[PDB]
Amino acid sequence: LEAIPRSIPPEVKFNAPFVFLMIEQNTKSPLFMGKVVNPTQK
Amino acid sequence: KITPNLAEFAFSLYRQLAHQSSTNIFFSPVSIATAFAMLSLGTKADTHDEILEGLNFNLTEIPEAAIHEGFQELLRTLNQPDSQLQLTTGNGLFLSEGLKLVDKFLEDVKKLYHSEAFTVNFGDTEEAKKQINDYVEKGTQGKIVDLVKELDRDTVFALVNYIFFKGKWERPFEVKDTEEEDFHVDQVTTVKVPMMKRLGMFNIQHCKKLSSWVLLMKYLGNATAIFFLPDEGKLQHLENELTHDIITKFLENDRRSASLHLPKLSITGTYDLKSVLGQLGITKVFSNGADLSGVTEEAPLKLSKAVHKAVLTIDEKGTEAAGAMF
């Protein structure tokens, strides 16, 4: 097995209030949208 | 042709819900839109324009004749998934047994909105409730159970609508990698949450306009998820700065190696859209001045309320979401 040096990629963590939406690729319309403020909140 | 109108409607409505609460937010723009766009068919005068306009439509420019014509194609299209993707939307019209509809109205909703019609007896509020809740439960494959819990006894007609979505990540997460991590709610409030992890190539990029990081996860099929991660103290900004086109740009993009941490979610939103929609101009239809002549010439009518419920599930396999309007 041949080993070569790596690269340590950067960490992208969504561990804070974030926004998001879901789009249908054809119509490019917003199926869903929302904001996650606290995933534990019910 | 109306995608931009919706896109912006979603944002309009969103900014309202974001202002009203801090709580997790989740709703289905398409769902709320087609439900009201459909109602307008049997609405007249201001109550009519008021609706259409609140959905971010400029009556002068794009004629209603073409607005409805558009919802027709948008619906027909959202219903032909890329096989690997499950996406469905149904519109049902429940009429009280003793009701004299207005032919045109039934032909329209059924034609422009692919609507179904049924004849329940609202006198038996338990059975009528059972029929509707069942329709929605079936359509949303169990995701949205008892949508209707309190139904008026004098209810003349209910205009139900549902949307179902189930897709798989085009590049899923391994369950063995998911660990419990910290999630920062406040600058002094942290909660433990099962964090999904995956190292690889992502469509992540940092849009400067929104001062946030934009991540794009494709779904096997014809759907894509967009996650906006705001830079320290810029969430309020991100929210206000969102526009259709900005979302159109990101999609034209590239790729990059990164180690992603995305929490798995199980959240649901329930809304009484009367307060919020009024804020967008839609008030007539909810008042004792609402004109629903288009539905029935019988007695005058009005909306007693507008309930919306959406439910989201995001795991390593992909995403499942349902939305229902009642």
Curated annotation (Swiss-Prot), chain A:
<comment type="function">
    <text>Reversible chymotrypsin inhibitor. It also inhibits elastase, but not trypsin. Its major physiological function is the protection of the lower respiratory tract against proteolytic destruction by human leukocyte elastase (HLE).</text>
</comment>
<protein>
    <recommendedName>
        <fullName>Short peptide from AAT</fullName>
    </recommendedName>
</protein>
<feature type="site" description="Reactive bond">
    <location>
        <begin position="6"/>
        <end position="7"/>
    </location>
</feature>
<feature type="region of interest" description="RCL">
    <location>
        <begin position="1"/>
        <end position="16"/>
    </location>
</feature>
<feature type="modified residue" description="Phosphoserine">
    <location>
        <position position="7"/>
    </location>
</feature>
